[PDB]
């Protein structure tokens, strides 16, 4: 499994693969690993569907509990602090966080990426892209060369899909586009208007274009 | 990796995949695992290309040494005896042997399949098909249902390619047809006229037909 | 032991074998491993009769306690949540859940199958069939080829019995139809009218027909 | 696997099952475990076909080497001595030996059964029957009650087949009569005229009669 | 030690041996291992006299406590549930339970046998006989052949004594009839009129008849 | 197993039991553990029949080789020296040696008993009796009280049989007189005229008399 | 150390040795190991004086506490139950209990002997004698032959002293009569009139007579 | 350390870094890891200078010994066979081989790359580029995107230097261009005219251009 | 076991006990542990009779071999050198050596005692007495007080017997005078006329006198 997040002017994009395996045997085919936990925040865990969905549900419940109790949503700094408490208490796969900062001075530079290390410490990415999972190295090396082509949301989505394809090309634990069954990776786009899921047809067309170009 | 061999009236077919990995990382893309070691005998080892090619070279050298020394090729019973000595001396992956018995009373029932267990003991298959490797179980379960359709060499080749596809569908260590790079599994057909390699275009067309049917 | 569940238009079917062993010695001959725990829900545990019956009794008591306390039966989403709490608390063999969703928009697509992994996480099957136990791989590989013939309840029952037969054919820990003692596998069918046990004579006739066809 | 040998007036009978497994998975279906190594001697090893056939071949070669060198066949006492040397050198499964003593004073009491323990020591049976393998206990307990019915070769063969059936009934590693595939146990009868293999039709009829009686 | 229980029309019988040893040395000669814990229920533990008598005393105290508190004896289903709680709490040798169901629809089919596995799970026997202990296998194999002769209480008692004799014949940890000291196995018969101990003279005569027949 | 040897005026007697077991299961019923290896010497090994018979054969071959080479039998001191070399080379059960010294000054005090310890050192008994095996302690304690009644060969034989009975009474690994099958212990008597085997009828009558007296 | 207790008509006797050692070095010379804990009950522990005296003191305090609280002495069945609770709580050497049952129907058969195994379970002796300690086997084997001579208290005392002498003769950890220092074993006799200590002169005379007879 | 080799039309290029470390401490600054061992063959070992230089010297001595003995240089197939013998004998770091095949039918497709796995098996690269060492993954991922720009020797050299820079950017064990000390990576170019070392000024200019472009 | 040697004017005396045990059980009663290996030399090993007698035989054979080869007996210095070679080669119990030096300048000071440590090094005693074995400490402490009374051979013998008695009084592994069986310790006296064994009656009288004095 591999989850990739990269920043573009005016927002941030997130995507993940759809494969879960027990060693050398394929366990699932349409595993969803990216979820929307808030109006301006999405999370992703590289692992089984159950762990990721439980983590997303717990984070959403915590955020909504604070929101209902105090009547105001938490600041982005406070959102990261609560997430790290949950990660430390659990310990395991580590989560990836991407969101939008609506209180930032510059709207064009408001997208954020947060990563947690093995020890549970959180770091804020400054290179504009981050990948986690087994194929994280290949995806990051691909984004290193492909990040110069990102200028808007569509370019960022294309680059993320290409990074996922490159990661799946070199890792057997990551699944590539399934053009026989029709199962493509899921993506989430967060901007000033909020976090929205990308429709499967645009994902499908981008994957088909990348596959045709690679031939 | 998975190597499948099945018997058809008047001969026998053998095929193998083209993937080698170090755990979760793909190492090779066009690995050849089936070789022709005699005029009426082919062998296959599920593993790296180097081990398989060295084993095939050693077996061919031994057979040719006996042939040149005594002026007559060994009997099929004597060929199996020498192979088991080589397997026992080495110990590891285990080989698969398929050949044609030209001294058999019935030419239509002359194809043979030989398998070696972990302890090194050899067994002669009587069910008409055999598969070895990590995806051997899935391939054998597929041939269990698909063996009723085998009536000639082409039907056997189609069934073998379908078995390889089914094995690759459930195992991440076995590679399926590569329709982007153009790398398809290798096959060997042995009949009364001798062992011959199958051209890559017929392999390609059968793989394409199977993929289209599966969609 | 092997428990197989597959979906058909308008419902879902579940079946299991009748063998329990201590290693290489047969312990029981008429072990029941599928139980009805609710009007629209059945469960199955691959193991001894005592563990399965205790699990079914506990689940039924929990469901009935909530039903009597709140006056309304739990939703299907809430039923899975309570079951996962019980599985996590115990840890062991893992359960298989099949039920009918009466609140679904499409009645023809209301059957559900739920599986729990080793870590205790629950997953909802989307491929239409699922098998658990020691012979799960063979049963799943058989259903992979036989699922195209399922169009109603009787077809699904035939396919499930054939899958159980194929699983018992390759595994020594799973028992096949006993035509001398008269012990055949047990099956449960859940539809819009509720969960009902299948009579032993229809099971017997289907097993006899399959055995005759295999000869 | 289980090999049973019992004495009848004027000879001795030997039989074995046709199942080989790797733990809980069935490996073979028509494994032969009883072989004729001399004109008045047969042997049987509970295990894989390769080990048993190699042991029989080695024993036959040794016996024939002595026979050709000295011009006279070895005495029965000398045959056991050479066999124990081979067993000790190897060490593992242990062999079972049955033969006819043509130099005995009483022709009716000439059948012999020899067993080797774990330490490699040989013992001559005096209770008239002996069983080795995983299901040896059940077979011996069955022969304990069924030995009173043995009065000739046919009665002994029936009792041996019934003992094999009883052993397979309680052990999952021993295979019973296959009335679908048509694979029945192999038997060898040794008398004053020499050791002969029993035809498969008489085996089949006895198995069918026993199965019908058990119903 | 070995405890055997078998069902006959209108009741059930239970018997056990009278030997306790510390490895290869005999410790006791007249150990009693079967006790009456209720008007329609008896239990037996294969082990030392102290453990069995303490278990029987505890079970009787629990049953009588419930009987005095609620004024009505427990149902047979409730009696098994309380016994399993005691077995689980202790963990060891495992108990054997035999009793009469006075609320059953058919009086002739009211005898019950309950067995507990190593994990502590309880199972209800359906084959009509059950044996526990070190010589359980031999006793069960003997009852397999001798169960066709059971038609009343006396026939069942004879078959149970013969099973105990056969178990003691092959196991050194089980004691046979002592015709020098005069110590014979103890038996308990439960019918519609209640559980009663069998007098030692009928046990003695049956043992003497069996010994004479075996000579 | 237990082997007992005691001295009487003018000779020495030796006897052993007829039981061999693998732990708690009886392996043999008529095991012979005492053999005659010379005209004035017998040996006995507590263990399986194969080890004892091989040891006796080797000792006899060594003695006969020296006798044929030098033309004169070895002295009793030289016989013990060669036996200790064989015991040390092997290392295991330890042997017991009893013989007659024809060169002794006093014919009435010529019987000898030799015992080997765990370290392999040999000792000459001076208390007049010695027992080896698992039940050696009970047999020796019985002979301690019963040695005052030995005045000739028949008295010594009776005392030896009684010692064997007492040893079997307290040890489960030693077999007592079998009055159903008719298997009684074997005995050897060595005097000035040589070593002779005792007929089974005198053994049988002495065992029957002892059993009757014990009742 | 060895403690021996045997029953005679109308009572019971108990005796023990006077040696305590730390391995191969003698620690004490006049250790007392038998104590009177009640009017009709005595106990003995094979070990150091401190442990035995503390155990006797605790048992006496418990018995007297119940006697003073309820005004009536405990029944013999209740006395054993309290003792087993003390033994189980401690866990070690195991105690030996001998007493008189004044409520028994037959006064001549009122003596009782109770033994505790390693697991802490109590057993009531029925063979009339029991010995515990390191030399228990020799003492029991001696009493086996010497029990036929017991007809009154004096005969039982003589037999007990002889058993102690025989146990000390074969065990280095048990001390025999000291005719230089004047230290002889201690004995306790319990009858209908109560438990009384035997004077040292009668012990001394019996030991001297036994020693003279043995010479 | 990282060694990269890639093929261009009419030849092949090889390059390596100049860093050797003991864990986290830098050991060397100008380590040479690529050597010319023949007129048409160069080798490279990722490790210390001593091991690489000894390996190159041994390979050159072996090749020259065969050349002088037989008067003709070895074929490319024979050169690989001798190298694998040396690798197997040593076992450790694994070598990388690049050379020119002058007997190939197509001069433009004559460059060869050979890699040895951990087990010592040799493989011939078909993807046109190969990298070994600690930073091999990053270098290979960089060449994956940069291989489309290779059309001649200079383009291949630029791509190799860029791959080395990318590998050093992500790995702390690989050294990048030293613009203060003046130490740049070493490169070897093999073509139809033979293997030649690249001058340090062209390496320096390419490194400077890449660094300027990256800024 | 304990062996004591002490010097008196004009010679030296040596004595040892007659007990051999396996832990807490007595093995022998008349074990001899002191032997005469030369005309002026005796040795003693604390252990089993077999080891001591074999050591004495080997030493005597070596001494006699040198004596016959060279025609002159070895010097006392050369005798110790050969003994140490034998001790070192064996490695275990350690020997004690006592002898007479006939070439000494002072005949009254010619007795010698040699001791070997655990490492095998030999030392010559200068305190006039030495004891080895388990009870060596007690014997040495007794001789420390009793050495002032030694003035001739008889006084030394009395002191040695008293030391043995004191050693046996405190150690359970050493046997004291047996006044019932008549087994007393063995002693050897070496003087100018040679080494001679002490008759058993003088040993007996000295032991009786010591025992009477101790009372």
Author numbering:
A (entry chain W), B (entry chain V), C (entry chain X), D (entry chain U), E (entry chain Y), F (entry chain T), ...: 1 to 91, 99 to 222
Lines from the paper:
The Mycobacterium tuberculosis (Mtb) proteasome system selectively degrades damaged or misfolded proteins and is crucial for the pathogen’s survival within the host. These rings assemble to form three interconnected compartments: two antechambers formed by α7-β7 and a central degradation chamber. Stacked β-rings enclose the degradation chamber where active sites containing the catalytic triad of βT1, βD17, and βK33 proteolyze substrates.
These structures mainly differ in the conformation of a pair of β-subunit helices at α-β interface, which we have named switch helices I and II, following the convention established by Losick and coworkers. We subsequently fit our molecular models to the first and last intermediate reconstructed maps and achieved excellent refinement statistics. Frames 1 and 20 represent the most distinct states in the continuum. The initial frame closely resembles our modelled inactive consensus structure of 20SβT1A (RMSD 0.44 Å), featuring additional conformational changes in switch helix II. This represents an observation of an auto-inhibited conformation of the switch helices in Mtb 20S CP, which we will refer to as 20Sauto-inhibited. Additionally, we explored the C terminus of switch helix II, which shows unwinding in 20Sauto-inhibited. Molecules that selectively bind to and stabilize the 20Sauto-inhibited of the proteasome established in this study, rather than the well-known canonical resting state (20Sresting) could be critical to future inhibitor development efforts that focus on allosteric rather than orthosteric sites of Mtb 20S CP.
